[PDB]
C-alpha cells in the first residue's frame, strides 16, 4: 500500500527525480488536509457499529434479501454480511487517512468480485448497502469529510461492479 | 442430521463409524415416526404456540414492548413474533433430524452478531423460546413433549 | 402476496395479543442518592 506521501516519493524515485515544485505542492496539500482526516477518522471509529446498523436498516431490512431464499437469510449469513460492511467502512477510513485508494485495491478488492460470484452474494444489494453507509457517515463526519469517505466508499462500489 | 454429525466425526479421524455411532443411527431411524409425530404436532399448533408464547413473553418482559424497547409498537411486536416462528420452525427441523445441526446452521451460528446489530436483547429471545416450550409441552404426551423439550432447551442454553 | 418470513404475517397476531406497554416511568436521576441507594449485599 501507499499513502499520499509515499505515492509522491515513489513516483519521484521511479523517475530518479528530487521532489520538484509540483511534488512539494502535493505534499503540502496532504499536510493541510491532515487535521480534517484524523478528525473524521476518530468520528467514524466511535460510530462504526451505529453507522453499519443504520445503513443495514435503511437498505437491507424487511426485504427479500433477509427473508428465506434471500442471501442474508440465516443468522450466519446475516452476520457475515454486516461483517462485510464493517470491512468496507474500516478500510474506507484507512484510505481516507492515507489519502490514497491503493490499500483498497490491495487488501479489499483483490478477488472480491470473484468471491461474491462464487458464493452468490448479490453485488447490487451490497453496493446499495455501501451507498447507505456513505449517506450515514457523511451525516456524522460533515460535508467535506463526508465527500472524502464518499470517494473511497464509491471506489469500493465501482470495484464490485 | 445425526448421520452427518457422526460421518463428519469419523471422517476427521480417517475411520469408519464406530459401533456406538451406528447404534444411535439405527435407533434414530427406528424411532423415526415418533419424531415425525412430534414434528407434526408443533407444525399444526405453531400459531397457538407462538401467540400464547408471545403473550407470556411480554407479560414477563413488558419493557421490550414499552417506549424505547426493541419490540415497542405493533409492527416491531409482529417482527418479534415472526422471529419466534423462525425458531419454532427450526426446533421441528432438529427433532426430525435427530441432531441440532439444522438449528445451529440456520439460527444460532453468528446470531449474537445479528441481534447485537439490531439491538434485540438476546436473553429475551431465549425467554420467548421457553414460553414456546411450555405451550408446546402441553399439546403432547410427556414422552413426546420430553423429546421436543430437549431441542427447545438446546436453543435456550445457546442463546443464554 | 406475503411470502414466508414476512413480519406482516404476524401483524394480526401482534394486534390480537395487544401487549401492554409499561407506563412512562416516574424516575429522575436528580432525586436519586447514588451512594445510599446502591445495594450493599
Amino acid at each position: 500500500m501507499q499513502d499520499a506521501i509515499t505515492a509522491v516519493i515513489n513516483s519521484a524515485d521511479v523517475q530518479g527525480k528530487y521532489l520538484d515544485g509540483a511534488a512539494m505542492d502535493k505534499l503540502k496539500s496532504y499536510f493541510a488536509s491532515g487535521e480534517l482526516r484524523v478528525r473524521a477518522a476518530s468520528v467514524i471509529s466511535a460510530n462504526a457499529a451505529t453507522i453499519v446498523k443504520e445503513a443495514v436498516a435503511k437498505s437491507l431490512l424487511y426485504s427479500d434479501v433477509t427473508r428465506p431464499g434471500g442471501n442474508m437469510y440465516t443468522t450466519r449469513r446475516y452476520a457475515a454480511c454486516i461483517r462485510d460492511l464493517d470491512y468496507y467502512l474500516r478500510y474506507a477510513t484507512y484510505a481516507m487517512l492515507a489519502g490514497d485508494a491503493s490499500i483498497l485495491d490491495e487488501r479489499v478488492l483483490n478477488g472480491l468480485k470473484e468471491t461474491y460470484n462464487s458464493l452468490g452474494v448479490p453485488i447490487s444489494s451490497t453496493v446499495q448497502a455501501i451507498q447507505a453507509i456513505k449517506e450515514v457517515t457523511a451525516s456524522l463526519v460533515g460535508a467535506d469529510a463526508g465527500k472524502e469517505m464518499g470517494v473511497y466508499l464509491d471506489y469500493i462500489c465501482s470495484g464490485l461492479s | 442430521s445425526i448421520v452427518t454429525k457422526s460421518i463428519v466425526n469419523a471422517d476427521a479421524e480417517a475411520r469408519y463409524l464406530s459401533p456406538g455411532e451406528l447404534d444411535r443411527i439405527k435407533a434414530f431411524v427406528t424411532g423415526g415416526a415418533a419424531r415425525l409425530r412430534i414434528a407434526e404436532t408443533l407444525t399444526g399448533s405453531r400459531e397457538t404456540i407462538v401467540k400464547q408464547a408471545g403473550d407470556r413473553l411480554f407479560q414477563k418482559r413488558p419493557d421490550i414492548v414499552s417506549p424505547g424497547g426493541n419490540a415497542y409498537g405493533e409492527e416491531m411486536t409482529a417482527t418479534c413474533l415472526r422471529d419466534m416462528d423462525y425458531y419454532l420452525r427450526l426446533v421441528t427441523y432438529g427433532v426430525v433430524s435427530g441432531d441440532v445441526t439444522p438449528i445451529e446452521e440456520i439460527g444460532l451460528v453468528g446470531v449474537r452478531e445479528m441481534y447485537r446489530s439490531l439491538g434485540t436483547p438476546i436473553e429475551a429471545v431465549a425467554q420467548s423460546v421457553r414460553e414456546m416450550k411450555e405451550v408446546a409441552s402441553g399439546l403432547m404426551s410427556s414422552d413426546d413433549a420430553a423429546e421436543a423439550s430437549a431441542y427447545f432447551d438446546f436453543v435456550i442454553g445457546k442463546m443464554s | 402476496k406475503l411470502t414466508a418470513g414476512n413480519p406482516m404475517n404476524f401483524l394480526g397476531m401482534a394486534r390480537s395479543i395487544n401487549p401492554a406497554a409499561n407506563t412512562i416511568p416516574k424516575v429522575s436521576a436528580q432525586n436519586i442518592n447514588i451512594e445510599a441507594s446502591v445495594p450493599r449485599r
Partner: peptide
Amino acid sequence: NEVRRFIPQE
C-alpha cells in the same frame, strides 16, 4: 419516542 416499522425503506 420512535416507533420502528417493519416495511422496507424506499
